[PDB]
Structures are given as structure tokens and as C-alpha cells.
Design a protein around this ligand. Structure first.
Ligand code: HEM
Ligand SMILES: CCN(CC)c1nc(N)c2ccccc2n1
Length: 289
């Protein structure tokens, strides 16, 4: 099972930069979503969830096939809330129908991170929509009510190491949890990509308690929250070291996140040797737009 990258016929970097810019402009415009968080964080979560179904043991799942567009995956309970990102991207797809679904979903995440002032994330085209029977079954995305051992083991399936895991979890600087989606509770929210996840972990005073849905989470006096899997990153001694590093080095966190996130979005894809180099898209700000 090989998924070969195939460039959308006749398309080049400028075509994709146009897609990037349409997403970026809509992000800027549709500013009231989720109490003024905007759609950035849900697009990041979407890109992660379309990718996180991958299994290195058989090369099934991952971003390549655009299979989130199919009912079984769209309705995965782990994907609750992500319908909002799909709806956001729908008109973008209508504007640029030549882009594959996996390319759009993954590009949405890249665009969101960069527009939220995160690192540049190189991105490659050529994901190809595959048929409904290639849709992975539900249950491949991780549970939040678990400990460090679970996190470490889970991410081995995505070929992620301890540093990659801690870097990718820093995306939890973004957005918030919603009781109706996940059974987790928290009013704190943010739409600027920073290393604040690590700084909160280390600096807040956390108390484990049951929330209003009877699920355990870690809550601070300030009103912030951590999932059990978030908090595991300071419970485990190896994870803790890396949390400290990223709390103390914004640039290292940005570089490590960029590499891990591109890897996440590329897992399962075979790029021919004559494939284009990864594209680094300019932000709207860099374009004077
Ligand atoms: C152990 C791994 C992870 C677990 C258990 C987990 C769990 C969760 C949960 C329960 C939520 C709240 C969903 C909602 O209630 O709306 C959430 C939100 C989010 N997650 Fe994760 N996550 C994990 C890893 C990641 C990764 C690797 C990324 C991306 C690199 C990511 C990005 C996000 C973002 C940006 C949000 C906020 C979305 C919003 O505000 O709508 N997560 N995650
Ligand atoms: C770093 C604190 N925030 C954002 C204010 C936060 N913390 C989290 N632990 C978190 C977990 C899942 C989704 C969003 C999240 N956001």
C-alpha cells in the first residue's frame, strides 16, 4: 500500500499560494466564530485529525486520501466540532475545485498556523482523493483521559518520538475545549500561536477535579485547564524536560513544531524524486494584503 503524491495537473506554487490567500482572507473576515476566537484553531485541529488516523504498520489512514469528506470519518465522535472547519473550507473548495480534499484540509492547518503568527510550515501538494472504502474506521485518534504512557505508546503508531509529541501538543496554546464536543470544560481561549502551553503548564497551580460532565481535568485558580494527556507532559520526567526546553526557547519550539507538523501532515505519502520541493507560503502580511 503506497500512496504516491501526484501534483494536481498543471498546478504550481502560485496556484497554491492563491488557495492559501483565500483561506487567510476568510480567516481574517470570519472573526466572530466561537466567541471571537475565529476559525484558526479548528482548522489546525482538523488538519491534525485528518492526519492522525495514520497507522505506520499498514500505511492506512493519514491525510492522503481526503477521507474525512466521507460520513464514517466525518461522524467519528473524536471529530465532533470539526464540521465547523469543513464548512469554512467548503467555499474555498468551490473557488478552487482542482485542489484535492487532503491537500485542502492539510493546507487549511498550515495557513491557520502561519496566519496566527506561528512558524512557517513547509507544505507539499499531491494528496489524491481515494474512494469511500479507504476511509479508516473510528477509534484511531487518541483519548484525552489517559496518562503519559498512553500518549507515548499512541504516538509510536504515527512514528512520533518524545520531542515530536511534546512539540505537537503545543498546538494546545490554541482555541479551547467545548463541553458539547468533548466533555471537557474551559473558558480560556487564544488565537495566537506561541509557546504559552508550556509556560502555563509550568507556572500555574493546577488542581485535578471533575468537571460539570463528570470527566477529570486539571484546573488552575486563573481559570485555565489542562486535559489529563496535557498534564501528563509534566508528570513524565522525559516529557517534562522537553516542556521546560520549549517554555525557555520560543524559536526552538517553533522550529521543532514546524518539522513535526509537516511530518504529521505527510505521514503515509510517498513523494517521487521528481516531486516539487516543499512550498513555503507567504503570509497575507508578507504580501501586503
Ligand atoms: C494526546 C493527543 C491529543 C488529545 C487527547 C487532544 C485532545 C483534544 C481535545 C479533547 C480538544 C477539545 C475539542 C473540543 O472540545 O472542541 C482539543 C482541541 C484542540 N486540539 Fe487537541 N488533542 C491532542 C493532540 C493535538 C495535536 C497534536 C494538535 C495539533 C498539532 C491538536 C490541536 C488542537 C487544537 C488547535 C484544538 C482547539 C480547537 C478549537 O478551539 O476548536 N491536538 N484537543
Ligand atoms: C494554554 C491554555 N489554552 C489556551 C488558552 C489551552 N489549554 C489547553 N490545555 C487546551 C487543550 C485543548 C484545546 C485547547 C486548549 N487550550
Amino acid at each position: 500500500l503506497v500512496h504516491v503524491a501526484s501534483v494536481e495537473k498543471g498546478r504550481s506554487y502560485e496556484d497554491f499560494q492563491k488557495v492559501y490567500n483565500a483561506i487567510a482572507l476568510k480567516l481574517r473576515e470570519d472573526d466572530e466564530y466561537d466567541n471571537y476566537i475565529g476559525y484558526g484553531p479548528v482548522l489546525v485541529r482538523l488538519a491534525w485529525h485528518i492526519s492522525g488516523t495514520w497507522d505506520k504498520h499498514d500505511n492506512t489512514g493519514g491525510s492522503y486520501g481526503g477521507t474525512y469528506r466521507f460520513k464514517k470519518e466525518f461522524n467519528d465522535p473524536s471529530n465532533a466540532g470539526l464540521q465547523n472547519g469543513f464548512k469554512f473550507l467548503e467555499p474555498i473548495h468551490k473557488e478552487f475545485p482542482w485542489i484535492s480534499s487532503g491537500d485542502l484540509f492539510s493546507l487549511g492547518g498550515v495557513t491557520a498556523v502561519q496566519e496566527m503568527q506561528g512558524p512557517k510550515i513547509p507544505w507539499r501538494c499531491g494528496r489524491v482523493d481515494t474512494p469511500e472504502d479507504t476511509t479508516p474506521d473510528n477509534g484511531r485518534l487518541p483519548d484525552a483521559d489517559k496518562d503519559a504512557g498512553y500518549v507515548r505508546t499512541f504516538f509510536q503508531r504515527l512514528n512520533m518520538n518524545d520531542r515530536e509529541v511534546v512539540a505537537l501538543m503545543g498546538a494546545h496554546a490554541l482555541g479551547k475545549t467545548h463541553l458539547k464536543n468533548s466533555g471537557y470544560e474551559g473558558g480560556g481561549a487564544n488565537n495566537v500561536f506561541t509557546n504559552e502551553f508550556y509556560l502555563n503548564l509550568l507556572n500555574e497551580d493546577w488542581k485535578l477535579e471533575k468537571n460539570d460532565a463528570n470527566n477529570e481535568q486539571w484546573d488552575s485558580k486563573s481559570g485555565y485547564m489542562m486535559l489529563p494527556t496535557d498534564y501528563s507532559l509534566i508528570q513524565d520526567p522525559k516529557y517534562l524536560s522537553i516542556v521546560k526546553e520549549y517554555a525557555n526557547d520560543q524559536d526552538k519550539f517553533f522550529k521543532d513544531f514546524s518539522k513535526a507538523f509537516e511530518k504529521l501532515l505527510e505521514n503515509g505519502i510517498t513523494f517521487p524524486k521528481d516531486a516539487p520541493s516543499p512550498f513555503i507560503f507567504k503570509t497575507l502580511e508578507e504580501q501586503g494584503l
